[PDB]
Structure formats: structure tokens, C-alpha cells
């Protein structure tokens, strides 16, 4: 689940159209819900909410805003990995 989020987060920073940003966020969201099932759970409601915020911008046709709005997702995701590896 974390490997899907990180791999597709490079696609957003590389894609240059609303067709590939929306598609990448769809896989990123599908894993975010999947990872949540397995405070830690409340840490994903913020992340999925930020995917909705980025996916809504990329749906309106603003690819440039989506890549700018997906940067804030990188810090939140990196915090969960640091918090999870400490717990395990």
C-alpha cells in the first residue's frame, strides 16, 4: 500500500495533463482506503481528504494546481511512514 502511494506520487510530479494526474490519484486513493483498513486510522482521513482536494482540482482541468496541491500530500504521507516504522 505504501509502495503504491510513493510510486504514483512520482507520476503526478511528472505528468503534464489532467488525464494522467486524475488517473494516478485514483490508484493513490484506492490504496489509501486499502491501507486504512489494516490515531493511525484518523491519520488517513486527513490523507484521503487531501487526495480528494487534489483530485477535485485535477478534475476541473487544472493540471498545474493539482501538481502543486499534491506536494502537500508528500509531507503528510512521509509523516505516516515515519510514524508507522516507529510503531512496528
Amino acid at each position, epitope marked *: 500500500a505504501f509502495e503504491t502511494l510513493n510510486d504514483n506520487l512520482k507520476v503526478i510530479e511528472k505528468a503534464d495533463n489532467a488525464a494522467q494526474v486524475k488517473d494516478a490519484l*485514483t490508484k493513490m486513493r*484506492a490504496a489509501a*482506503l486499502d491501507a486504512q*483498513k489494516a490515531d493511525f486510522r484518523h491519520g488517513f*482521513d486527513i490523507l484521503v*481528504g487531501q487526495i480528494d482536494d487534489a*483530485l*477535485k482540482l485535477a*478534475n476541473e482541468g487544472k493540471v498545474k494546481e493539482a501538481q502543486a496541491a499534491a506536494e502537500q500530500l508528500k509531507t503528510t504521507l512521509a509523516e505516516l511512514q515515519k510514524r508507522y516504522w516507529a510503531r512496528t
Partner: antibody
Amino acid sequence: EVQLVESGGGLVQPGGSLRLSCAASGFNVVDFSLHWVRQAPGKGLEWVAYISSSSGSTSYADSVKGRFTISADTSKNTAYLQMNSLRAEDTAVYYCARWGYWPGEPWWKAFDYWGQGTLVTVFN
Amino acid sequence: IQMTQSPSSLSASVGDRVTITCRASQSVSSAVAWYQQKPGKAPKLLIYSASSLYSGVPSRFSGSRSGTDFTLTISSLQPEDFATYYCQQYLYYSLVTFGQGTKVEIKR
């Protein structure tokens, strides 16, 4: 009791305009996005359009974008679907769905409550 | 995405067990729902999140998931369970695609 009722379906000339309204009772539209799904007579369900009145977003199916224009009215607690340039493939029964807001359980509920459905037929 | 549902028409007598298979085109995590459309009426939700039972339906309905392959299993049919069952995925608000549709018929 939560219920949704539609109106406005009826005979329309091809290329004409028809307006479908989904009067919502027992809840507030601001707390639940309203979706429209149509069923061609004797076929499977298909998605049409949705409006999230809290955020103002709106999307349409690939086969309908550019013709339909869905709007919501919180004061009257209804959601209107304006249909323009109807063709022969738009004859169906249009259901008005409901769907919770992420996050939490209500998002997982999917289309828990459905409308009665109004028949829209294009006629020569 | 695309959602294939089989069998498209099956027959089973009262008291028999029915398995309906739905297979997504790509991974949809656990976003699958099953509806039951009686002839001439609006569909009703039966299973949501692909495994949970919606409150208000008899307990005989059950769901399952194996990777990207889903299944709706009826433990024991009754004369009130003869209708069309549709398989839906709801991965995102704008990517909703329904299955073809399985119809259950009386066997004689």
C-alpha cells in the same frame, strides 16, 4: 422518513429540452451529494451526473457531458437536472440517488436511498 | 474501468445455493456493491464495501473478495429472491460502472 421523489419526465421532441427535479424530503441536500442514474428500458443501470451542493462541484458521464446541466437549490431542498439536445438514446428511467460525504461510514453506504424514478421518452 | 458479471442468467429452486461472480477490470480495493432490482422498481442495496451486509436485508446474502474477483452468495433462496442482481464498483464519484446483470429464474 428519508425519501426522494422526481418529476418532469414525459414526452419530448428529439432535440428538445426537459427539466427533471429531485425533491428531497427528510434530510438536507447540503449534507449529501445527489446523483442521477438512468436505466434504459430493459437494460442495466448507467450513471448520468451528480452535484455536491456543499462544495459546488459537478461532473457528468462521458456520453452526456456538454448537454446536461445539473444544479441544486438548498433553499427549496431539491436538485434540478436540465437536459438539452435529447437524442433517441436518452429514453430511460432516471433515478435520483443519495450518497454520504467522506470521511466516515456515510461515504461507504453508497446509494442507500433511491427515488421512485421518472420516465423520459423522446418521441416523434 | 469495466465490470464483467457472470453468469448472465441462472436457475435455482427454493432452498438451493446461488453464487454470482463479478470480476473487475483493474484493482478497485474493496469498493463493490450488490443491488437487487425487482422487475419494474428501483434497485435496493444489499452488500456494500464488498463484504458487509447492509442493515435491513435478510442475513442470507453474503459477499466476498479475492483480489479483484468478487462474489455474492445466497445461502438459501426463497420465493422473494428472484430478481436481477447488479454488481457495482464505486471507486470514485465519476468512475461508477455497473455490471451487466444476473437474473435468477425458477427451475422446473
